[model samples]
Target: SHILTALREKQAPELSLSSQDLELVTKEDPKALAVALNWDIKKTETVQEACERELALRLQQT
Candidate 1:
């Protein structure tokens, strides 16, 4: 929910992301979530990749 709120505020594109994935990311550190918001989407091939990358960073931080 907070993740969605942040994404909504940023007017992020309608990514093909699942609620479960969003929830997993949201469960990570807020800083990691912020990182997702700042991602250079052009460098990512898909929403799944972006989510995976963010989740990876989040796990590393933990």
Candidate 2:
């Protein structure tokens, strides 16, 4: 799913918020993150979604 999205998209959508790992990324508000990290809304929000999905998956296994 993640890779498919990556293949479908243009440019580095995740790299837009490319300061830290998604674990750290989800901790802050992506709006503030976007403003502070200097990424646009859609990309930041997509990063947020990806973070939550991965985070939830991580938690479920342990």
Candidate 3:
């Protein structure tokens, strides 16, 4: 929770994501992190792609 809180808050430079930190995050908690960010995080489709698609759709409103 502390790690997630730090990332969300950007509480420090690099958000405390040093090389080891990233390796740990990627290995141990990527899915959880994605969930925290409301990300899709699947192999066939990803949260970023979904977000982009949603954004494009919304842009059509204007």
Candidate 4:
């Protein structure tokens, strides 16, 4: 999950809150909701699903 990965890697300043605190912040943060609303959900989901499927197939062959 990019969300968890970003939190683990500290790659997103917007996710600066601790993992434990993220859930709490997510509920109250309008900006976060806006970001989600603005995102290209179908494209992002499709791309990620494809990547995961490809990785799984590669692993199966190896």
- The TM-score of candidate 2 is 0.51
Candidate 2 local lDDT, residue 24: 56
What's the best-to-worst order under TM-score? Answer: 2, 4, 3, 1
For candidate 2, the 10 contiguous residues with the lowest summed lDDT are 7-16
lDDT of 1 by residue, 33-61 (tens): 44555554443224434566665565577
Q: What is the C-alpha lDDT of each candidate?
A: 0.47, 0.53, 0.44, 0.41
1-62 in candidate 2: lDDT tens per residue? Answer: 45334423432323443335544556657655565445567876675666666665665766
Candidate 3 ranges beyond 4 A from true positions: 11-15, 28-30, 39-62
Best by TM-score: 2
The runs of at least 3 residues in candidate 2 whose Cα sits more than 4 Å from the true structure, single-residue gaps closed, are 1-24
Ranking by lDDT: 2, 1, 3, 4
RMSD of 1: 10.5
Per-residue alpha-carbon lDDT of model 4 for 1-62, expressed as tens digits? 57645432332223244444433433423344335434355643443344345444544665
Best candidate (score: lDDT) = 2
Once superposed on the true structure, which residue ranges of model 1 sit more than 4 Å away at CA?
Answer: 1-45
Error of 4 at 10 (Å): 22
